[PDB]
Write a protein that binds this ligand. Structure first.
Ligand code: HEM
Ligand code: HEM
Ligand code: HEM
Ligand code: HEM
Length: 107
């Protein structure tokens, strides 16, 4: 099975780039993020053609890149979706982990 890459990975499909560190997400199963497609876990970049390649941040289809990173009620938990649950009622953690600005995701 594929190995986790180094920390400091930059997601930069957009003008609001975010750094992702695998080391802080070890408690999450690889396949929770690199989820099954056609029955097999897919480790291709999220925005690969035919995947989440729609850079229209309003799109909520299975192709919406912004959607897969931010929204709730999705088949696999998104960045913000999981972080919301992690922060719970903790407003400082809400700011750190789900804030739209001044957070660990967006400066
Ligand atoms: C868990 C053990 C685990 C593995 C294995 C793994 C692998 C992996 C690879 C090989 C990449 C590089 C992709 C490329 O070709 O550039 C990669 C990238 C990302 N990962 Fe990962 N990963 C594992 C676990 C997790 C977990 C727990 C999450 C989510 C909570 C996660 C997320 C990401 C993200 C985001 C990327 C960047 C991909 C992009 O298109 O920007 N990984 N991982
Ligand atoms: C890469 C790390 C990556 C992320 C992040 C990601 C997330 C994601 C979410 C949050 C959903 C749910 C959306 C919803 O509204 O329910 C979701 C769904 C699908 N994805 Fe994905 N995904 C990542 C990677 C990839 C790759 C590499 C592809 C294409 C090969 C891909 C495709 C899809 C498709 C299609 C779905 C729907 C699957 C289903 O069972 O309905 N994703 N993704
Ligand atoms: C999805 C692409 C995604 C991003 C981006 C992301 C980022 C992120 C950061 C920047 C941190 C803080 C630590 C660091 O700098 O590495 C952080 C921390 C936690 N996360 Fe996350 N994260 C994304 C996705 C997910 C998903 C899908 C989950 C859970 C299913 C998850 C969980 C966590 C947890 C737990 C932490 C640590 C909590 C803390 O208080 O530090 N993330 N993430
Ligand atoms: C909070 C509600 C919040 C907002 C709003 C927000 C906005 C935002 C924008 C405008 C983009 C760029 C979209 C485009 O295509 O122009 C963007 C991109 C990413 N985000 Fe975000 N964002 C909010 C919060 C968070 C949080 C808390 C995280 C991480 C846990 C996060 C992550 C990401 C990721 C990943 C991207 C894509 C980065 C890239 O590929 O360039 N956002 N966000």
């Amino acid at each position: 099975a594929p190995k986790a890459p180094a920390d400091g990975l930059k997601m930069d499909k957009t003008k609001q780039p975010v750094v992702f560190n695998h080391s802080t997400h070890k408690a999450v199963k690889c396949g929770d993020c690199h989820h099954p497609v056609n029955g097999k876990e897919d480790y291709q970049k999220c925005a690969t053609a035919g995947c989440h390649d729609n850079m229209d941040k309003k799109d909520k289809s299975a192709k919406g890149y912004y959607h897969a990173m931010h929204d709730k009620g999705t088949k696999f938990k998104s960045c913000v979706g999981c972080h919301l649950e992690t922060a719970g009622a903790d407003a400082a953690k809400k700011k750190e982990l789900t804030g739209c600005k001044g957070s660990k995701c967006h400066s």
